[PDB]
Amino acid sequence: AAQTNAPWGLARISSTSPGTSTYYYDESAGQGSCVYVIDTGIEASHPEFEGRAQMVKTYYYSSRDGNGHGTHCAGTVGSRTYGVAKKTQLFGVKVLDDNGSGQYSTIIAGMDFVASDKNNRNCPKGVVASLSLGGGYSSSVNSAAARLQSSGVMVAVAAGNNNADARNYSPASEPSVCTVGASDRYDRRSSFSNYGSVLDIFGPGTSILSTWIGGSTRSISGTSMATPHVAGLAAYLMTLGKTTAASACRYIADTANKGDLSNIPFGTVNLLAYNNYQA
Ligand SMILES: [Ca+2]
Numbered sequence: 001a002a003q004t005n006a007p008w009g010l011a012r013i014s015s016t017s018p019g020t021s022t023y024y025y026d027e028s029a030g031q032g033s034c035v036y037v038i039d040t041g042i043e044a045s046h047p048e049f050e051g052r053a054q055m056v057k058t059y060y061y062s063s064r065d066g067n068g069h070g071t072h073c074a075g076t077v078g079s080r081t082y083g084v085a086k087k088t089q090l091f092g093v094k095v096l097d098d099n100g101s102g103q104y105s106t107i108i109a110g111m112d113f114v115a116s117d118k119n120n121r122n123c124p125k126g127v128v129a130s131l132s133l134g135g136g137y138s139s140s141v142n143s144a145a146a147r148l149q150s151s152g153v154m155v156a157v158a159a160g161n162n163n164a165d166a167r168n169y170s171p172a173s174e175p176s177v178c179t180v181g182a183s184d185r186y187d188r189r190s191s192f193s194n195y196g197s198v199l200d201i202f203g204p205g206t207s208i209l210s211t212w213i214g215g216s217t218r219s220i221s222g223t224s225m226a227t228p229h230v231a232g233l234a235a236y237l238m239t240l241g242k243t244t245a246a247s248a249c250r251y252i253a254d255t256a257n258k259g260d261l262s263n264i265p266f267g268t269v270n271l272l273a274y275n276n277y278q279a
Helices: 008-013 069-078 104-120 139-150 223-239 248-254
Strands: 033-039 053-058 089-094 126-131 153-158 178-183 201-204 208-212 216-220
Touching: 008 201, 008 223, 033 069, 033 104, 033 223, 053 104, 069 089, 069 208, 069 216, 069 223, 089 104, 104 126, 104 139, 104 153, 126 223, 139 153, 153 223, 153 248, 178 223, 178 248, 201 223, 201 248, 223 248
Parallel strands: 033 089, 033 126, 053 089, 126 153, 153 178, 178 201
Antiparallel strands: 208 216
8 A cells, every 4th residue: 555645754664765755554554453542632533533543541530632642643653644554443541631741640550551451442463552651760650561561562652852861761761661762854863852772663753744633633743753653553563463562662673774863872773663565
């Protein structure tokens, strides 16, 4: 399959070189997989989700996305136009309020929720979680992310936007999950992206067009935007039978475009997510 005039990030994930604008992918498109988006929620009624999105949990007085951030992330995972895995099922877990804030205890509860709730969903090709959130180091937050991964969910988490070493942030610093840095259209590390030995992979994170609340669309930037590219890629690869939740991060790193990014600090991986699709 080929989507012409795709967002640059989708084109990049299917390309050995920057500067192209068509997204190429196997038509299976993540069918039979599920991705949980743990964030501010998802506007499920957005035409771009085609009935494939559902709120499953909230810790606040509403499950609606009153922010936009979660809807944007969900769109990059699996909207028809802006998504990597255009046939995946999307499940929203609102651990962040409409200001994008959340107490660590609520975030941890949301991760443990997904670890159980996947047993209530039909996801024969496998389960992914995209966590576009972060705060300072907390062993408890890291441990929750490790449990979620351990339960059989491919966990992708944002490295953070501090232009700092991700070892000081959680869940970014958790070794057993997939920590994702952000890059730009010109294959440079995004200026805000955290870095460090704890990073596993880079994905497109600067100027990312995707869905927003009120049925609209928006371009925004963050390691929160790179993460769902990787989450979506994982879902896509799992439906293709190429990998499993346990080894998808490893598989993505093994099959990445290597040594192509600039401004990568010494000791940080130079690996950009790539679907290796031969059209
Ligand atoms: Ca690891």
